[PDB]
Amino acid sequence: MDRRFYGKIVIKGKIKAVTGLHIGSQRDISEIGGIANPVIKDPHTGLPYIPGSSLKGRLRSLFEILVNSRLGEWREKYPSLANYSPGSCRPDNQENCGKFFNRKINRGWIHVCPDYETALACPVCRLFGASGKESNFPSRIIVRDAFLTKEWEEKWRAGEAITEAKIEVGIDRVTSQANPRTNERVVAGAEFEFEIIYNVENTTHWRDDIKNLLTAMALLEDSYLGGSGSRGYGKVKFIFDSFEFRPLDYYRTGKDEDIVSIDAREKSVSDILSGFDSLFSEVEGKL
């Protein structure tokens, strides 16, 4: 029922790994000698990269929890939060319990609204996406895989390293028994170029849906991005290159009339700061 199209707010920018960044994926593919904890690297270049699933998942899981806490007062702002209660469905094996975290993936519980009509009003699944039997609300954001910036390509050409091997150890409290290991993590300070496209489907609710994306990002700068994380290995920081609106009249004609917002030297918390009405003011003229 009624899917439309008005443009695509494109968020261009650069992810700056302030602390060592770690993602991790498979190893030993026709290969013997490694450190056995390698960050995912694409095969054509052999350089590390931030995936889209590792960024869309961590922007999601930091925005289930914000909703899970303020579930009580947002039923008036957003309908279909009255189907839910704060908590997990884990103590009793139900795919639809009274609580919020309702869908069993394999053995874990992830909030996904079961219908198109239920997910249309839900703040989480209207943005990040949903699924079900026969109803299936699809997403709006396309989080794309982030690769190193023009500069950090050349530091792989000039000879500078990009991955470091940190040795961590475990210690018994009694016999001081050293239990060591090694990690491959991204060198601290490397910088990946991300891009997050927001498919504007309804002009009624994009202001309260861009603000939710900049809420999940502003939590991610205080939390970590994948990896061991609680011991420093995350600490990621968004550096916005350009917001661009990419309207509907752009795609037919080809005129460079796409609305460009000013995000030169601003924090992710400064966009959502009082001035979000002023940064995206000229988007209101196009609706």
């Binding site: 290969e31 013997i32 000698g33 490694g34 450190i35 052999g46 091997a165």
Partner: protein
């Protein structure tokens, strides 16, 4: 046990230097000998963490053979003296274990400076990983 480390090593060392070039045989021989290479390195300790700088040095230009550069001069320089620096930093009981591992690769490195770059170093790098892989299977890592 260690009595196999005395006989099988002295059976293999005259076969080692007599095939000093890395392009000896692309057939079943270089894999059949490579199990015997790790067979007398089994009874020795042969820790890999000192070799991790050498193998990552072999790793970082293995992509650079693959349309990165056509020059393995700067890499194979760095592999020769660091492998001499292996006994050149680490001595002791691990030195008698690492002297026997020195005498196989050092005849093959000197080929690789004047060798082809797409060829004859892949024939080394395949003999590189044959030594490591069986060594994990006989009980060492």
């Amino acid at each position: 046990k260690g009595k196999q480390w005395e006989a099988i090593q002295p059976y293999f060392d005259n076969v080692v230097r007599e095939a000093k070039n890395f392009l000896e045989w692309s057939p079943n021989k270089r894999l059949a000998n490579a199990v015997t290479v790790a067979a007398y390195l089994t009874s020795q300790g042969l820790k890999t963490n000192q070799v991790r700088k050498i193998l990552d040095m072999a790793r970082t230009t293995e992509l650079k053979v693959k349309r990165g550069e056509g020059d393995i001069k700067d890499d194979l320089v760095k592999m020769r003296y660091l492998l001499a620096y292996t006994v050149g930093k680490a001595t002791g009981q691990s030195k008698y274990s690492l002297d026997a591992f020195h005498r196989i690769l050092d005849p093959m490195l000197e080929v690789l400076m004047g060798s082809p770059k797409k060829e004859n170093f892949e024939k080394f790098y395949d003999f590189l990983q044959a030594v490591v892989a069986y060594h994990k299977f006989f009980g060492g890592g």
